[PDB]
């Protein structure tokens, strides 16, 4: 419940090994979030889901269908 | 080479203007919300530097990774891809870019939200998506394509008929590999190349050193040092001497925060340009003349650097 | 067409649901309302500050004191209230330059996304841009960027060229692909396989030069049609 | 221009397309080959 980080000493946040999208940004790759019994957890943020693209010198992927996305800016 | 962020400074303006003196701190309250609106401005600048960095690098939804087999048809990305030999897995060019770019008075420096090892995982994901799947990882799911067939599409994209690639593929691969070799020599032998990022380091260091040196100024008081005034004088005159130091130290901070707001707007315009070069040069193939380097653009590779990004167009 | 129209109509329906249910959605416009209200509250609260005068209120000084000392107490208020306004006007000039940069971007998105179709990646939303619709909002604009996103990938074997009778054939538009036994030419952004013919392909040189060329027949549409 | 198999490409039967119109498409081969 007392935890040294590159941002400073962090107190009252439960350190967690699992990594999530950044909810509240603490700094130096650390974020915190409120989660389940509930506590503020602190974790190293996850940058996104990992993906080995299925590359080879003669394999191509071609899309057999589409979706019309509407996005709001 | 493009600036993308700057050092996230924060100043405790009560400790800068006064520091431990309760006498000065109570006089500084008579100026109202000037100290809280200086902190509000520097916090907005600091949060923007994380946004500027997020908008450039976090353009990729998934951390793509390159295959173990380098069957790229003669093209050699070893100098731009992550080096597993290193304590932080930067590329060989990102190691040059990180080598070539180089008190107590309430002034502090906050860390960036993304560590340099997270920025290098984003440039790795952008680059591994680009090599294994072309523009497709920006416009939808990453669709794999052989790298010679991706460059044959990059050739059609400049009005050069794609047989011109397959009939010259070893020449084109050797010219690419040689030109990627020249980047390391060009950066290593040209100190004025990284000078656009080193000037971000130099300007923000010079601005903090100017802010610290301004604590040695009298501003018309009997002494620059608040403890000389407080040890020698009594409240009817001491508060008249302290108001000269408060007025000058408050003007010294208002000057600094105004320069940092104007400098943040300049870094943000550069980070918006770097985010646009990421989308249009790295995630695509720009038709825009001289946007992605001088020539008919084929593709760009992002490399991270301190306070910035580097595009190998 | 009915599928594309239904996907468009459904995607426009989700915008109303998203903007109705999500409070943080218009946060870029509401922050521009909040920053200008916070700056005026800060400017007005600074009238309650003494700046070292006997009172924050100018009518206290003028009712209690008389000209020699009243003008000393008033000049402390003038000095601080003038510095309070210079701070507001400086931060509004810097904030106006940020809003102008956003208005220049919105004017460029109007021209290139609404009045056109954009080849610029991620300029008019994520996906390959089809079109955009402007909707007005308080102090801003909202663009509803319609984009084609490819959605059901399938893996194929591929080749850069085909060897027919010694000639190397390349696709005019599209890619050579195989289902595992037969070769087709398909457009790049949607799987629609065609038989490989001298119409959808062009020759350049011979089988010796191209790395990864494959042996397959290219159909000549004239040959049976010439006399049979 | 006169509609020919050079200006146009085929895809499938009539019935898939909403608002298709019946018209002749000229073949540059067949009449020149017959002549």
Curated annotation (Swiss-Prot), chain D:
Entry superkingdom: Viruses
User: So which residues have sugars stuck on them?
Assistant: 22
Function of the protein: Subunit of the fusion protein that is processed upon entry into the host cell. Mediates fusion of the virion and cellular membranes by functioning as a class I viral fusion protein. Contains a viral fusion peptide that is unmasked after S2 cleavage. This cleavage can occur at the cell membrane by host TMPRSS2 or during endocytosis by host CSTL. In either case, this triggers an extensive and irreversible conformational change that leads to fusion of the viral envelope with the cellular cytoplasmic membrane, releasing viral genomic RNA into the host cell cytoplasm.
- Can you name this protein? Spike protein S2'
Q: What is the lineage of its organism?
A: Viruses, Riboviria, Orthornavirae, Pisuviricota, Pisoniviricetes
């Amino acid at each position: 419940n007392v935890f040294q980080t590159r941002a400073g000493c962090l107190i009252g946040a439960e350190h967690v090994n699992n990594s999530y999208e950044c909810d509240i940004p603490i700094g130096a790759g650390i974020c915190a979030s409120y989660q389940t019994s509930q506590s503020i957890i602190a974790y190293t943020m996850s940058l996104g889901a990992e993906n080995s693209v299925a590359y080879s010198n003669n394999s191509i992927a071609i899309p057999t269908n589409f979706t019309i996305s509407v996005t709001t800016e | 080479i493009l600036p993308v962020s700057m050092t996230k400074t924060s100043v405790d303006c009560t400790m800068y203007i006064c520091g431990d003196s309760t006498e000065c701190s109570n006089l500084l309250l008579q100026y109202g919300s000037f100290c809280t609106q200086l902190n509000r401005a520097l916090t907005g600048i600091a949060v923007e530097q994380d946004k500027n960095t997020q908008e450039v690098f976090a353009q990729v939804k998934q951390i793509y990774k390159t295959p173990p087999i380098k069957d790229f048809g003669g093209f050699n990305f070893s100098q731009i891809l992550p080096d597993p030999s290193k304590p932080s897995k930067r590329s060989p060019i990102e190691d040059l870019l990180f080598n070539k770019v180089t008190k107590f008075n309430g002034l502090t420096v906050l860390p960036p939200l993304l560590t340099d090892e997270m920025i290098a995982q984003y440039t790795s994901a952008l680059l591994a998506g680009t090599i294994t799947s072309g523009w497709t990882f920006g416009a939808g799911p990453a669709l794999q394509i052989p790298f010679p067939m991706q460059m044959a599409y990059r050739f059609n994209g400049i009005g050069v008929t794609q047989n011109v690639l397959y009939e010259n593929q070893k020449l084109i691969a050797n010219q690419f590999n040689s030109a990627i070799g020249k980047i390391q020599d060009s950066l290593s032998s040209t100190p004025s190349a990284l000078g656009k990022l080193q000037d971000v380091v130099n300007q923000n260091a010079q601005a903090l050193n100017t802010l610290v040196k301004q604590l040695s100024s009298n501003f018309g008081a009997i002494s620059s040092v608040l403890n000389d005034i407080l040890s020698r004088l009594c409240p009817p005159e001491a508060e008249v001497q302290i108001d000269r130091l408060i007025t000058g130290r408050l003007q010294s901070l208002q000057t600094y925060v105004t320069q940092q707001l104007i400098r943040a707007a300049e870094i943000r315009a550069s980070a918006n340009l770097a985010a646009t070069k990421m989308s249009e040069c790295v995630l695509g193939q720009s038709k825009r003349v001289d946007f992605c380097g001088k020539g008919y653009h084929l593709m760009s590779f992002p490399q991270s650097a301190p306070h910035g990004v580097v595009f190998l167009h | 067409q009915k599928l594309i129209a239904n996907q468009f109509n459904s995607a426009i329906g989700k915008i109303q649901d998203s903007l109705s249910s999500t409070p943080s959605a218009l946060g870029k416009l509401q922050d521009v309302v909040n920053q200008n209200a916070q700056a005026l509250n800060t400017l007005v609260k600074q009238l309650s500050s003494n700046f070292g005068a006997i009172s924050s209120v100018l009518n206290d000084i003028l009712s209690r004191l008389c000209p020699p000392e009243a003008e000393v107490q008033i000049d402390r208020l003038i000095t601080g209230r003038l510095q309070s306004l210079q701070t507001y006007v400086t931060q509004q000039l810097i904030r106006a330059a940020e809003i102008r940069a956003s208005a220049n971007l919105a004017a460029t998105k109007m021209s290139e996304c609404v009045l056109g179709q954009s080849k610029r990646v991620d300029f008019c939303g994520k996906g390959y841009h089809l079109m955009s619709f402007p909707q007005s909002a308080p102090h801003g604009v909202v663009f509803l960027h319609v984009t084609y996103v490819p959605a059901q990938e399938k893996n194929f074997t591929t080749a850069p060229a085909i060897c027919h009778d010694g000639k190397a054939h390349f696709p005019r538009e599209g890619v050579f692909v195989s289902n595992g036994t037969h070769w087709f030419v398909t457009q790049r952004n949607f799987y629609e396989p065609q038989i490989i013919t001298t119409d959808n392909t062009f020759v350049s040189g011979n089988c010796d030069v191209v790395i990864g060329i494959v042996n397959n027949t290219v159909y000549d549409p004239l040959q049976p049609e010439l006399d049979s």
